[PDB]
Amino acid sequence: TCPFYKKIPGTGFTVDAFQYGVVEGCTAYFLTHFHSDHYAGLSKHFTFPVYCSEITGNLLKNKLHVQEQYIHPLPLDTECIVNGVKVVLLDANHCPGAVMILFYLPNGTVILHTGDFRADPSMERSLLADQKVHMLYLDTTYCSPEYTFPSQQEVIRFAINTAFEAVTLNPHALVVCGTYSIGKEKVFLAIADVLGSKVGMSQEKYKTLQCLNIPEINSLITTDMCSSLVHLLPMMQINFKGLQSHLKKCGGKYNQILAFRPTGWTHSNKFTRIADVIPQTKGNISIYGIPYSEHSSYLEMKRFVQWLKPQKIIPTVNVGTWKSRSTMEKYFREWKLEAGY
């Protein structure tokens, strides 16, 4: 049955709640972003209103075949009225088309649902700064102090310099990047840009990327693998077996693979600096795991919440164990006592 943390009190609304069948008394279904744990249950047979960003609405129509008449795309940073309730969509700094939702309840409560997000100081200068928020439904994916990672910029710098060095030393090396959902496009696009190549990929992934309003995208991507030296493959294929196989398929155009696996967190982060990351190598195949995150680190999350000073926090991630739930609640209390709210 729909969990309470997917329900907006004082409304008929749910958030990212498409796998429960008909939610009793739900009059509008919001979808924060096009990731499968969040959209699970949507299809062409869905007949209730879905509210989302334009980008998410492009993916609903073209990838899942949801009928146009049930898709209600909203512009960002704009006050809109949904079943008589004022809402605002904000950028979540997650994947393309990912939003946070501000709800202005008839009774005067203000609720922010972060969806999935990577907190950033730039958020402290959106429409959020203009009023107080009573309840925060928070993406707590990495809500423990061991979760530190570098800025997205430092990670991309590492990958561009790595790839450029390797292909300059060996003009017959192939670069491969893994993916399993939208997000992290900067990894492969930045690498192709410094090499003067387009990124080659399957037809289904090219279609997905064409839904995202990325500027000049027809200049960066292609379904012709032969004319490309940066290839995008399913994340599952980013291993020595999968890559040896792929290399065979290129028919002696290439003799070396350099592959990147943008992961979430990995425990080398507590110890290792980005400067200090090394690949795993077998034969003429090297694999780099790089900590390119689109969720908040512990410290980024803490800053955001201490800035916003909500009255009540409802976690949306890691809620399934008592030890997790209890630990998070302890961090929220420290944050509030340290900051004085």
Binding residues for Ni ion (CB under 5 A): 35, 116
Q: What would the DSSP string read from start to end of 47-94?
A: -S-EEE-HHHHHHHHHHS---GGGEEE--TT--EEETTEEEEEEE-SS
The minimum distance between CB 120 and Ni ion, in angstroms, equals 16
- Could you tell me which of 15, 196, 217 has the C-alpha nearest to residue 101? 15
Nearer to Ni ion, 34 or 158 (CB): 34
Query: Do the beta carbons of residue 257 and residue 173 sit within 8 Å?
Result: yes
Nearer to Ni ion, 116 or 185 (CB): 116
The least distance separating Ni ion from the CB of residue 54, rounded to whole angstroms, comes to 18
Q: In this structure, which amino acid lies at residue 186?
A: K
Question: How many Å apart are CA 28 and CA 50, to the nearest integer?
Answer: 6
Q: Nearer Cβ to Ni ion, position 298 or 335?
A: 298
CA distances from 333 to 112, 329, 341 (A): 19, 6, 10
What is the torsional sign of CA 64, 69, 75, 78?
Answer: negative
Closest CB 94 distance from Ni ion, rounded Å: 6
Q: How far is the CB of 176 from Ni ion (least distance, A)?
A: 23
116 vs 300 by CB, closer to Ni ion:
116
CB 29 to Ni ion: min, Å: 17
**Nearer to Ni ion (CB atom), residue 9 or residue 41:** 41
Q: Mapping DSSP to helix (H, G, I), strand (E, B) and coil, where does residue 127 land?
A: helix
**Among residues 5 and 335, whose Cβ is nearest to Ni ion?**
5
Q: How far is the CB of 138 from Ni ion (least distance, A)?
A: 14
